[PDB]
From Swiss-Prot, chain A:
Glycosylation sites: N24
The name this protein goes by in its record: Glutamate receptor ionotropic, delta-1
Similarity-based family: Belongs to the glutamate-gated ion channel (TC 1.A.10.1) family. GRID1 subfamily.
Source organism: Rattus norvegicus
Tissues and organs where the protein is expressed, per its UniProt entry: Highest in the pyramidal and dentate granule cell layers of the hippocampus.
Localization per record: Postsynaptic cell membrane
Assembly with partners or alone: Homodimer. Interacts (via extracellular N-terminal domain) with CBLN1 (via C1q domain), and more weakly with CBLN2; the interactions mediate the trans-synaptic adhesion complexes also with neurexins and are required for ligand-gated cation channel activity.
General function of this protein: Member of the ionotropic glutamate receptor family, which plays a crucial role in synaptic organization and signal transduction in the central nervous system. Although it shares structural features with ionotropic glutamate receptors, does not bind glutamate as a primary ligand. Instead, forms trans-synaptic adhesion complexes with presynaptic neurexins and cerebellins, regulating NMDA and AMPA receptor activity and influencing synaptic plasticity through signal transduction. In the presence of NRX1B-CBLN1, forms cation-selective channels that are proposed to be gated by glycine and D-serine.
UniProtKB/Swiss-Prot annotation, chain B:
Protein name: Glutamate receptor ionotropic, delta-1
Localization per record: Postsynaptic cell membrane
Full-sequence range covered: 777 to 813 of 1009
Gene coding for it: Grid1
Source organism, top-level taxon: Eukaryota
Function: Member of the ionotropic glutamate receptor family, which plays a crucial role in synaptic organization and signal transduction in the central nervous system. Although it shares structural features with ionotropic glutamate receptors, does not bind glutamate as a primary ligand. Instead, forms trans-synaptic adhesion complexes with presynaptic neurexins and cerebellins, regulating NMDA and AMPA receptor activity and influencing synaptic plasticity through signal transduction. In the presence of NRX1B-CBLN1, forms cation-selective channels that are proposed to be gated by glycine and D-serine.
Quaternary structure and interacting proteins, as annotated: Homodimer. Interacts (via extracellular N-terminal domain) with CBLN1 (via C1q domain), and more weakly with CBLN2; the interactions mediate the trans-synaptic adhesion complexes also with neurexins and are required for ligand-gated cation channel activity.
Organism, scientific name: Rattus norvegicus
Family: Belongs to the glutamate-gated ion channel (TC 1.A.10.1) family. GRID1 subfamily.
Distribution of this protein across tissues and organs: Highest in the pyramidal and dentate granule cell layers of the hippocampus.
Amino acid sequence: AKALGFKYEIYQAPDGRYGHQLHNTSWNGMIGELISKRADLAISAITITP
Amino acid sequence: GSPYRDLFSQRILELQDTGDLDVLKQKWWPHTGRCDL
């Protein structure tokens, strides 16, 4: 925000569990929020997956 | 602007997800050599 001059918000996943990859080949959590695109980002501890 | 990056960074991450990034490093560059240390 300070190096660019642009805005932000602070939201939360009700799980807070990195999501769970389903055998539906889908997700809850931080990833299912962006499958639905209810969110924009997730800036925290991150696990890396192809 | 070339819509290619996630296609290719897929293959970037996957080679170390397989660890075949390490295999191809060790192919033309084994860590052992004549001097082991």
